[PDB]
Design a protein around this nucleic acid. Structure first.
Ligand SMILES: Nc1ncnc2c1ncn2[C@@H]1O[C@H](COP(=O)(O)OP(=O)(O)OP(=O)(O)O)[C@@H](O)[C@H]1O
Length: 542
RNA sequence: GGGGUAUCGCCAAGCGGUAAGGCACCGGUUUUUGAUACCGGCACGCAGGUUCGAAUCCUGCUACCCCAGCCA
């Protein structure tokens, strides 16, 4: 799976520009990782592995105010869970604060940096617009000594937040807004989750990222399109300080998934306002949320591989994601029996207490073994598999027809029983004792096959059916994305599953025949009532 | 004003000489899961122009995304 980035790397390896590739994944610890990040992780860690190079995990923790240790830990966890390993120790842009400061000093001594005393509002007014150039600050001409003293004051804590900031001296008229004297350092009297309260001044993204890449020996710095203008500043910094290497930035388009939001801020809102059960809610586009949903790390890598890596904006369809998980779970998850919409179905013909049938763990894979499941005379069936009257297009059970029970005998409906509101309560039938292995005795073709759960064992399992979190394709575009949340993103149903499912361990995928793929939801599951999340439904369509 | 993007419904390969593939959808075969597997169906923003030859080069144009945080 090639892309414009790998081609660039090949070209560098060839020309001799580089003799090894070194990339990095730099997530800000201000929320959990989502499927979007996974794309960046696969692209960065994948390239490293594929070229026998190294990929660093660096927390771009330059803004203490929006960061928390909770995220650092969950991000490490999700990167590991995806199957990747970073080179060396976990890095932190904060590991370079002393270095950044030293570089800020080098810029000041060369007259490429100064301390601006213009207020946060005045800097915006002096910035210009998209069509009008900005104007130089009245402080832009201080002398080296003065800037030197003033920056020390900033660091010493002599200025209140916003009262001062260090800016790079570039061009207030540049058509690139980012080059209009970008702020290098800003004052914040906040506690840092790594440096505590040692610093009252913190470096900005643009000043920090390139120096961090540089110090780490990064060869190809890979980010998203919204940073293309920034590259000019990225290069400006490396070109004006004393540093032996000059990593190059290459940008690719970010991933967008229909019916969901990818923005950290918006995912945080859903969590803060409790519209989901925390970052790892099974309806969330987060790595951990997909994990709880039943997605496999392997399926996510397949997805990231299929969507590609380009510069064209894009919004992948849910079907593309779902296709990947069905593919991984189809040949791996062992089949089981469960009924989500239960209805009593007593077969008068049958006598006794029951027996045991041999059910395969995978109809096309014998190597997966088989198991023993109870067969009583009061089995459970799904409402959707029985109908008093139905055309030749209905393959299930008719009021006077005979359907075939999965890995059992050909049942045959005869009578029905309803309640005081027309709803059926029990379905009485009969069976052919000479079925089991195969053949309908005489030869009468049996149309269709349905799943069931003998009421003998029958484990009362709770089932969670999830659906799109938003009722519109691009919820982000809405005026208020929250107002377009799908009220039925979650529907809880009570059903019955074969007894063997009590051994189900959270993290193990199961394919409930004729229904979909499920897995135990540790968070809700109890010693009494085990809960199963429906990862994805089976391909449904008559 | 600057930076970018435009190839089948959604992705994507293609880098001047026959428009890959995946997803979705539509058929058919096999199937004791309406599942799977298998087979088949599914084409270059517009306008000019250079070239024997253009999705690939040039001119003009249109559509859309990003940039006016002391966020990243
Ligand atoms: N949706 C995405 N698709 C691909 N890469 C992404 C996506 N979102 C962020 N990234 C990239 O992966 C890394 C994520 O870092 P970071 O957490 O700072 O992004 P972010 O901007 O905070 O996330 P968001 O933009 O979703 O709020 C960066 O390289 C970022 O460019």
């Amino acid at each position: 799976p090639t892309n414009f980035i790998r081609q660039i790397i090949d070209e560098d390896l060839a020309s001799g520009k580089h003799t090894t590739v070194h990339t990095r994944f730099p997530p800000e610890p201000n929320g959990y990782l989502h499927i979007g990040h996974a794309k960046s992780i696969c692209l960065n860690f994948g390239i490293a592995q594929d070229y026998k190079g190294q990929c660093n995990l660096r927390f771009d923790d330059t803004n203490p105010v929006k960061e928390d240790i909770e995220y650092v830990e969950s991000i490490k966890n999700d990167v590991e869970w995806l199957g990747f390993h970073w080179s060396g120790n976990v890095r932190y842009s904060s590991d370079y604060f002393d270095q950044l400061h030293a570089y800020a000093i080098e810029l000041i001594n060369k007259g490429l940096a100064y301390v601006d005393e213009l207020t946060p509002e005045q800097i915006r007014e002096y910035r210009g617009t998209l069509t009008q150039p900005g104007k130089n600050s009245p402080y832009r001409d201080r002398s080296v000594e003065e800037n030197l003293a003033l920056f020390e004051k900033m660091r010493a804590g002599g200025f209140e937040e916003g009262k001062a900031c260090l800016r790079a001296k570039i061009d207030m008229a540049s058509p690139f807004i980012v080059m209009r004297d970008p702020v290098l350092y800003r004052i914040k009297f906040a506690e840092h989750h790594q440096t505590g309260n040692k610093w009252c001044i913190y470096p900005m993204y643009d000043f920090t990222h390139c120096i961090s890449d540089a110090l780490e020996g990064i060869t190809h710095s890979l980010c998203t399109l919204e940073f293309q203008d920034n590259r000019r500043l990225y290069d400006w910094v490396l070109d004006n300080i004393t540093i032996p290497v000059h990593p190059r930035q290459y940008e690719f388009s970010r991933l967008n998934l229909e019916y969901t939001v990818m923005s950290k801020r918006k995912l945080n809102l859903l969590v803060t306002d409790k519209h989901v059960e925390g970052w790892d809610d099974p309806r969330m586009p987060t790595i951990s949320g997909l994990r709880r949903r039943g997605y496999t790390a392997a399926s996510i890598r397949e997805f990231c591989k299929r969507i590609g890596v380009t510069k064209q904006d894009n919004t992948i369809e849910m079907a593309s994601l779902e296709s990947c998980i069905r593919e991984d779970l189809n040949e791996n998850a062992p089949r089981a029996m469960a009924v989500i919409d239960p209805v009593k179905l007593v077969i008068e013909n049958y006598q006794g207490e029951g027996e045991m049938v041999t059910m395969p763990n995978h109809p096309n894979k014998p190597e997966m073994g088989s198991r023993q499941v109870p067969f009583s005379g009061e089995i459970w069936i799904d409402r959707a598999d029985f109908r008093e009257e139905a055309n030749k297009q209905y393959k299930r059970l008719v009021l006077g027809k005979e359907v075939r029970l999965r890995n059992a005998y050909v049942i045959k409906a005869e009578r029905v029983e309803k309640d005081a509101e027309g709803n059926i309560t029990t379905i009485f039938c009969t069976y052919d004792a000479d079925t089991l292995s195969k053949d309908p005795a005489d030869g009468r073709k049996v149309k269709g096959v349905i799943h069931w759960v003998s009421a003998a064992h029958a484990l009362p399992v709770e089932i969670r059916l999830y659906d799109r979190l938003f009722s519109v394709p691009n919820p982000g575009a809405a005026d208020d994305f929250l107002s377009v949340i799908n009220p039925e993103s979650l529907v809880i149903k009570q059903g019955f599953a074969e007894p063997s499912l009590k051994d189900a361990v959270a993290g193990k995928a199961f394919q409930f025949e004729r229904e979909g793929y499920f897995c135990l939801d540790s968070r809700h599951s109890t010693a009494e009532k085990p809960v199963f999340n429906r990862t994805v439904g089976l391909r449904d369509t008559w």
